[PDB]
Amino acid sequence: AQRQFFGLTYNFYGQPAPLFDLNDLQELAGCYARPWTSRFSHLAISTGSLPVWSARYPSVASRNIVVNTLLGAHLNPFAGGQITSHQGITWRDPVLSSLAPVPAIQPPPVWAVAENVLLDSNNYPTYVLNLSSMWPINQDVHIMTMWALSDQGPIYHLEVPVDPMPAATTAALMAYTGVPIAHLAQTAYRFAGQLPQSPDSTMVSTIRWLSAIWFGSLTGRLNRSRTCNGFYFEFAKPALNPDQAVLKWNDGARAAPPAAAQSSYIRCISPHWQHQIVEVAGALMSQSVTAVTGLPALIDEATLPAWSQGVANLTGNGQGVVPCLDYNPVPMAAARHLQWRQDGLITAAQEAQLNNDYTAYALTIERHLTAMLVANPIAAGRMPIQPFNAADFGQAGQTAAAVALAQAMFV
Amino acid sequence: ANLAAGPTVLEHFDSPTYGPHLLLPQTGDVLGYSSSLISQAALLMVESVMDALRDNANASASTAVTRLDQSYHPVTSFDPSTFNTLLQRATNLALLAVQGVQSESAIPAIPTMSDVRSFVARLMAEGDPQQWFPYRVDQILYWPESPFVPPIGPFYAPFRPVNFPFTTGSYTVVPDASRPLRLLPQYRNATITVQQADDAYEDTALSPLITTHGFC
Amino acid sequence: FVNEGMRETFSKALFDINMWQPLFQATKTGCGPIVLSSFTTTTSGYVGATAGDALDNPVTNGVFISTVQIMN
């Protein structure tokens, strides 16, 4: 199995208490059911099937970004050792099964409102003693810490063993073909979130390879022509919502295996991530892997927020680090198209349009986040949109770097 | 994970014998060491903790031992909070016995039931469970400022309490006094108030004390 | 009775002594840090200067220091 996880809470963006409403606690972690492996029950085959627009949570990622804040205020055990309680709320039992109003006669010591508290699955001697049971809380704090170490888009991880796909990993994928990127992260997430599965387990390879192929596609390389072992993701033609992704085992030239171990931490860099069901289901999925395998190594420090420096066990700076790249959906897709255009996939006059098509699309998932941003302030104690300042949108982050990290990953 | 139902699982973190083992005591409990049948699980702890203590006692700089400590360690089905079960009390004392602490009462080279029982008795006696080094399930926090030098792997974290009272050094064993030794009294600074320094005496004094006269 | 301000003094006095903690242990004198909460108590009743005026100061679980304590 795996008995060791290190987390880091969200950052109260220049704000007092944790940016989550009581109305939220009873909107995700409520109903008394275990708020744990629920993160995914708020996503659809796409975006047009969710209440992710003008509403309490105006974003295809506004849910997790909230449930994640709510998790910070109720994770004191892993911080210090005791259970504590934040505003009349504290886990019912030592197993942290769920949340519930403070008892009445034996209330837990009121939590201490502190931002960015590190976490150690050791500071809580009961966790590992029950592992199996509260297994979920692990993979979750992990999903958290991969969004917390970042400020503008979750930071997942990518791999590619120098070997060919693990047979029973080409068989497991060939049964997930038609399935959309959403339902893939689904199985991915749903999987590594119940019963400690050994990192050796088949599924981990499969769901870890499904996070390497998704990336190759997101950067042309692993396209309809140059597939992985036979797979690649086909994105919906921009003009009718290109924010899609479906796995498709083809049979064109197989992108030869890399010359070595290709590891790197990639995170969406522009606010765009917050509303692209594919930029989340994908990233979220790549995180399903890390959750049941500790954490490859230390994520490079360089490009990362101010509250994520030398974050013990997580962030690094020295050798045990892996350069962390951050791409921008538009500056990205543009090259993703150029790649297609080069492999004869499309016409030479069709990419100067494919971009128009998609670029206008990104301009739509832009006047929307800004609207929701200047709709749900932040001083309002809530953070469904997560501040971003009308700027990062164009921000041509690493991008160019990851577009190269994709080629070396699928030579 | 698979043997999590078993009573408890002791494991040697410091250089196991033939490679990392994972001792699992059967459920039964031995008769003899305590009036209250001590579970085989907890007895193994005492027997080992009573080594790390007796070993620290005479371990020297010039000598090289197999393991920097002989104390066992509970890894499953162990209650970390309370301090009732002989095991919990013993465990709590081993996290301290890994620092080099030695028992004032010399622990015999060949522990005998009479002796083991006199230790398992001293352990049960109401007291304060050492709190400098908190307990973990996969790591033994060892004082950095302590003789003990961690093996290698991921089992020893160099945790430093805020204020550990122990300093280092050893003690050369001295033979048992053949007769009651008189002690000249040299005073300290603080002084107790007659009132308090009275009952203090009257709470632990042997009042109706039978005494021989001898010959004047 | 030990009114609020009069605790400021005995605390300010003891505070200036606790400071020298590292030298008390070093030289085996002293006897641990002196907490002012070791000389007081938590009685309750009416506290004044005379029955007449003490009647207008019902204090509950106030902090008083007994004479023999005001001595130590």
Binding site: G80, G81 | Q131, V162, F164 | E8, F15
Partner: peptide, 30 residues
């Protein structure tokens, strides 16, 4: 009370030794 504020560096149990002056980026809270 008086003086600088301390907090259990070793967490939960405060043993008179666990406590340490709660200093930080702002200096020490007195």
């Amino acid at each position: 009370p008086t003086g600088k504020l301390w907090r259990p560096v070793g967490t939960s149990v405060a043993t008179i030794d666990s406590l340490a002056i709660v200093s930080d980026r702002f200096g020490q809270y007195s």
